[PDB]
């Protein structure tokens, strides 16, 4: 009769790393990095996206000719946007604060279009100057949400202008000012020279003066126009003024919703999906805490790490070989993690362990659980653009992004290692502690084999094995017969 | 005669957390965590802070009418403000720069105010102008520290005033340009439209028009007066002209005492305590590593952390269960740690062992110490204010917070998991290799019991004990009785 | 006959620190932190530096007449510029956006000068003048690289200039505007009052005016010039307008190679010495991953740290002292780490045992290759230059830089201790584990002496040891033997 104790192996090929040791094959592993995504550009939570198309937020904003399907849009959850827009301000000029309003973008999730000066008050100037920059069907054209103030007759009397906040939320306001390429311009359009335009609120004011000077051409025209935007709160008064060279507002901006969205920059077009997280180069639908995609990312997603594979190991080392478990494993054990072989008169078999596999398993599902429900509150990583004057912000902000992931990635990894060691030689001790239990229970009524194994020294019947693996093992009971079987 | 080898148990219960399981009950426990204030505003140092009150800087700054118990402040350990405080800027305006001012000031400990421009030398103009929105007693007036120059009869000369700096450090110097609301003011006020003001040092070169407009009312006007603040350095002169629409400086603030100082935001009262380390909430005092009170803080302050619990394990498992350390610990060996129990013919009592005890308890307070003061900070007076033209900057600088603070969270609870898990192998590691080292050194002249105990087959007395508890024991002596009663 | 098993010791005097316990002897150990520079200024990678001297780059890109040797520089690998230049401007003034010219130039290997407006195609103004503040022995003189514009008689044209950039890659152009002191000297420079200066490309365009104003006096001199920088791209072209108080460019720098370099604030002088990494207190030349010379770095460099030592243990604790592993290391085995000592009748001596002793050289070689090779990404503190207008900036950038350094130092200093705590512990568990072996495969024909060796019952020559030391033991082979003597 003989008992002997060991381990469960199988025929897995996975492979986990250790800081003593590489390509280690183990039973049991959990992958908890997501390398994998759809490839497709869909929609986060029910709500679609705003595809731009090849209009920039200026000529949303501002009302482009060739921007016209956007002059009415519902809810979103993030605005598609190209690296290079090719429909954008029309008239050649620039955009004051232009990275500011990308930001605000950034927190905004649906904008409502209220006129609060209509086209027909001016009923001192002209209203329908247009330039074949923004041209449509030929014939000249201008922006469909600005009013181009011209002289009317031989005279250009002061205009004035105000508006008062009575919405109910905030409101984004986006006037403009004229610079000519020659005099004779100037007077052929505002009939006076040394204007001025003034914009006022209770927290805001400004007076630009116009700038005549010859440049090189832009879209045909030595002209250009200069934009700015400003947020008027509630209950608020904004107040405009202008002897020339005011292209002012139609429309003003009402922020509806507001959230978390942000501008992703991407080149392809919304196709019918669902999601909850999303990356330029495709989506994510996971439940894995990270992943490797894309460090910019859009919703509730997994965190990100430079990192190629990230495996902890779950199960024994395999080590495929009766001798026990210093020799090798065994492949007849298909219960549980650690057993017993017995061989006896009446038979033989293979057995598992309960108690010993259960705090085992317990334990490393403990172990996975605080590595993944203690490694979220990672980084972000998000969008945000910088002028070609500030490129010290630009290289701090990509510094400061960079050193976080770097961190994040090494921690992970190092902690993947580390646990892995530990796991294996938790394994390891767990084998080594049933068998000193057992040669503890056993005492000197079995002799050893040197191979994990026990040969009795009387008979072992299957309620003796039963009482052996339960821990219930009576040594006076068989004491006497067996000092007999030694002696002789 | 049994000699036992067991460890330590008593009625406590804490717990500790490890990393393959919970909630584990342990004898004794460290906690590197404090979460205790006091909930009030305290001196730092022995040096009371500075209440602004109701008023702001800018307010203190200028002079204010009713902030008229701050036109002496002696020296103060860090600046108490409001949220949105109430006596700010009577008369209607802005500030520039002025984030850059409130920065400066968190480095300045005390101010002293010097004559740098009496307001009698202005003999050619009218100084004694105010207005209502800063009123005492109904009666029009003006902040404390400037000076409205106005016209003396039908004529506005030209303004020149000069200083220099011979104080004996670096002051600070505010002047401000006045917008007036319509062209009758102007004239009424300055005599002559079309004006300047130039205010130069040997760095600093400042040319401002004023420009009039219809705005909307605040506190009652539509005028506005903009204010503008410089740093003159040491044995330089400061320049001011002017032809109209300047509010010149009576008092320069010369920077007496320079330190590690703060801005912080309640809306509390200081009261009568010393403290050493403050934050909005209260103070902190404490010798522990870690807290999770508030992010802000002011002085010698342990790190902050999100964190609810951080528990470090200094002694044994707390199984309770005469046997041995395979049932579990000894209630009765209050002595120790790891110890031995005895019975032979005089007597029967317990022990406890000198050298393991030591080296554990010395392991052990090493392990704490090294986790402890491996963490090294400074002052730490974070605080940074941002205006609503600067967002990306805020959202860079709150990120840069947010991740530091999880980087060093996640560094806490790894340290602490593992060194928990480590203490607790270390304790059972030590319990058997004393096992290991008196069943080595006693030989066959025993027996084995299977529960942690040994069986004597000679007749053992004290001085044998003693003999095995220090290391001593004689095997040559005590063979010849152990083998005639072995082989029986 | 006795057998007993042990390990290796020497004279070595290598202390490290674990986290147990600190000043720890051990037989091997690495240094893997550099502490040590040459002390000079080298050529990068056979490039040398480009030594600026007294010089700014304001005053090396504007043509300072006392820094007429870098009228034509060669490649450069890196700028030295001291602290507090002494020469730059000559005349007084200001440079608009200073920082961020140096840190383009914080990216660029090489610049060719192109005459882009000759000095005699203004054939109606007059192109002399000079000041006494960048004097050449005594007479006046002006910027080498700038031309002055004054009347030609008592007329001043309207100036007009262009330039087409066809050269083949981005060029930097620098203009300039005086500020006069008196209305005087402006009438008799300029002859006319209320000028300006348009500057204007396809993406830029300034107007500014200049003001009169008397200021103190800064080399002698009231006035000042304000001089500003473009950077004009491929195919564009710059215009240049004027009727008073222009300072034109005569020569335009194309940026010709692109890489990484850098400004190194040093007092120093180059001195002939090659180099693949450069500190501003000298160079390294080494192959360890970590150093503690300076944060700012230029080249292939290590990484920085703020820690005293960093020594990893890679051999087993040295306890000096035949007996086994029990009482201490032996200093006869050099031959190996772990080993067997042997002692029967035709003689006695060492040995070791190979396969342990090559397991634990790979694995601590992985261990320590896991620790260098890991430490990739890091940090890399570039140097940034801020105004006093940006002190909010500045301190994000230091508390950034601040944050990671600490960040790093703690987690190497972390894994260093946890590291040496693992490898003394896996050094005994190693021989603990060939002591348990041995014993193991040799059951019960032997005797142990408490003391880490074994003796025999019957005789063994050195076939049966050398045997035995490779695994290879016949018990039934002598199990009679052992027996008759055994039960003896
Ligand atoms: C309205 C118009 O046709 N203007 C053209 C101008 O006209 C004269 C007319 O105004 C006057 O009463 O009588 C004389 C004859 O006695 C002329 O008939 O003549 C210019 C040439 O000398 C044309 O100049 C060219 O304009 C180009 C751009 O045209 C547009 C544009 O598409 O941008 C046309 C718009 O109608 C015009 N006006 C408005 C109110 O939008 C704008 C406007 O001039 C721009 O703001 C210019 O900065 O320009 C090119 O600029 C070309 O270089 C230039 O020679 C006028 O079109
Ligand atoms: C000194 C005074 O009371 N001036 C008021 C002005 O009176 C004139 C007189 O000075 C002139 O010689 O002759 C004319 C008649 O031809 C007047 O009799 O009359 C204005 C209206 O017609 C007043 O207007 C109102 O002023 C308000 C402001 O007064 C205060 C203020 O409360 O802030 C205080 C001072 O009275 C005033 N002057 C000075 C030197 O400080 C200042 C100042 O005017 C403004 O604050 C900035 O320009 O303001 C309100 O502004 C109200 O809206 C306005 O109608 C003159 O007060
Ligand atoms: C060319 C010259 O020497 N001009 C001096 C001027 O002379 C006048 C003369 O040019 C004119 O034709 O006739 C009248 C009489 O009808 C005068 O004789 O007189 C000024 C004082 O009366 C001098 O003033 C002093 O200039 C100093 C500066 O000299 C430099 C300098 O070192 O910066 C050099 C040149 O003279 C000049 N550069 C030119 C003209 O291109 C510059 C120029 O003034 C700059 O704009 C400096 O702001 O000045 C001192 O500035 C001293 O403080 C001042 O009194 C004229 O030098
Ligand atoms: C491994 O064995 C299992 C039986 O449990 C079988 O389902 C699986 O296909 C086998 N895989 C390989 C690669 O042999
Ligand atoms: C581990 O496997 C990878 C590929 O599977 C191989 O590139 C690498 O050399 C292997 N390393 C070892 C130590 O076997
Ligand atoms: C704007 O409208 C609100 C009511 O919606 C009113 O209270 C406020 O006085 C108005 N503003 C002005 C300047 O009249
Ligand atoms: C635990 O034992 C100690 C003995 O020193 C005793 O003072 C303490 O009160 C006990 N715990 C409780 C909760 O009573
Ligand atoms: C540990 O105790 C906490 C209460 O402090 C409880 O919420 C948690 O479920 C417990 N966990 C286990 C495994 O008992
Ligand atoms: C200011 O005073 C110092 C002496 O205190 C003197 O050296 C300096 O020249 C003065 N400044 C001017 C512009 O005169
Ligand atoms: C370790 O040795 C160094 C010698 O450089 C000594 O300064 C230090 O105090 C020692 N530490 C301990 C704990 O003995
Ligand atoms: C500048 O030169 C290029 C040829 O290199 C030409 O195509 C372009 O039209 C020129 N620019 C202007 C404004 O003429």
């Given at each position: 009769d003989?008992?002997?104790?060991?381990?469960?192996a199988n025929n897995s090929t996975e492979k986990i790393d250790t800081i003593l040791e590489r390509n280690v094959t183990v039973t049991h592993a959990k992958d908890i990095l997501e390398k994998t995504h759809n490839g497709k550009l869909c929609k986060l939570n029910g709500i679609p996206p705003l595809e731009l198309g090849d209009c920039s937020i200026a000529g949303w904003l501002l009302g482009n000719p060739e921007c016209d399907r956007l002059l009415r849009v519902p809810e979103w959850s993030y605005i598609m946007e190209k690296e290079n827009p090719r429909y954008s301000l029309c008239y050649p000029g620039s955009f004051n604060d232009y990275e500011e309003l990308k930001h605000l973008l950034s927190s905004v999730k649906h904008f409502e279009k209220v006129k609060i000066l209509p086209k027909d008050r001016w009923t001192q100037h002209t209203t329908t100057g247009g330039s074949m920059a923004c041209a449509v069907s030929g014939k000249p054209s201008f922006f469909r949400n600005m009013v181009w103030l011209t002289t009317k007759g031989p005279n250009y009397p002061v205009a004035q202008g105000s508006y008062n906040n009575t919405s109910g939320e905030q409101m984004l306001i986006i006037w403009?000012?004229?610079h000519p390429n020659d005099e004779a311009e100037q007077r052929a359009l505002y009939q006076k020279v040394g204007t001025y335009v003034s914009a006022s609120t209770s927290t805001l004011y400004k007076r630009s003066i116009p700038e005549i000077a010859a440049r090189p051409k832009v879209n045909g025209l030595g002209s250009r126009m200069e934009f700015s935007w400003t947020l008027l709160d509630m209950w608020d008064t904004i107040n405009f003024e202008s002897t020339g060279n005011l292209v002012a507002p139609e429309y003003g901006f009402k922020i509806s919703?507001?959230?978390?969205?942000?501008?992703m920059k991407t080149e392809g077009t919304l196709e019918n999906c669902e999601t909850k997280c999303q990356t330029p180069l495709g989506a994510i639908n996971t439940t894995l805490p990270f992943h490797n995609v894309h460090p910019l990312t859009i919703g509730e997603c997994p965190k990100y790490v430079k990192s190629e594979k990230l495996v902890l190991a779950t199960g024994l080392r395999n080590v495929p070989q009766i001798a026990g478990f210093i020799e090798g494993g065994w492949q007849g054990m298909?219960?549980?993690?650690?057993?017993?072989?017995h061989s006896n008169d009446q038979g033989s078999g293979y057995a598992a362990d309960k108690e010993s596999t259960q705090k085992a398993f317990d334990g490393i599902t403990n172990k996975v659980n605080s590595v993944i429900e203690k490694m979220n509150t990672q980084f972000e990583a998000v969008g945000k653009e910088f002028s070609n004057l500030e490129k010290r912000l630009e290289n701090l902000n990509k510094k400061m992004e960079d050193g976080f992931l770097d961190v994040w990635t090494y921690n992970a990894e190092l902690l993947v290692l580390m646990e892995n060691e530990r796991t294996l030689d938790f394994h390891d001790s767990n084998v080594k502690n049933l068998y000193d239990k057992v040669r503890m229970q056993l005492r000197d009524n079995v002799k050893e084999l040197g191979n994990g194994c026990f040969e009795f020294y009387h008979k072992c019947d299957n309620e003796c094995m039963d009482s052996v693996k339960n821990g219930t093992y009576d040594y006076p009971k068989y004491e006497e017969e067996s000092k007999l079987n030694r002696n002789e």
């Open positions: 003989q008992i002997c104790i060991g381990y469960h403009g000012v004229h919703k507001r959230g978390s969205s942000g501008i298909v219960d549980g993690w650690y057993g017993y072989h």
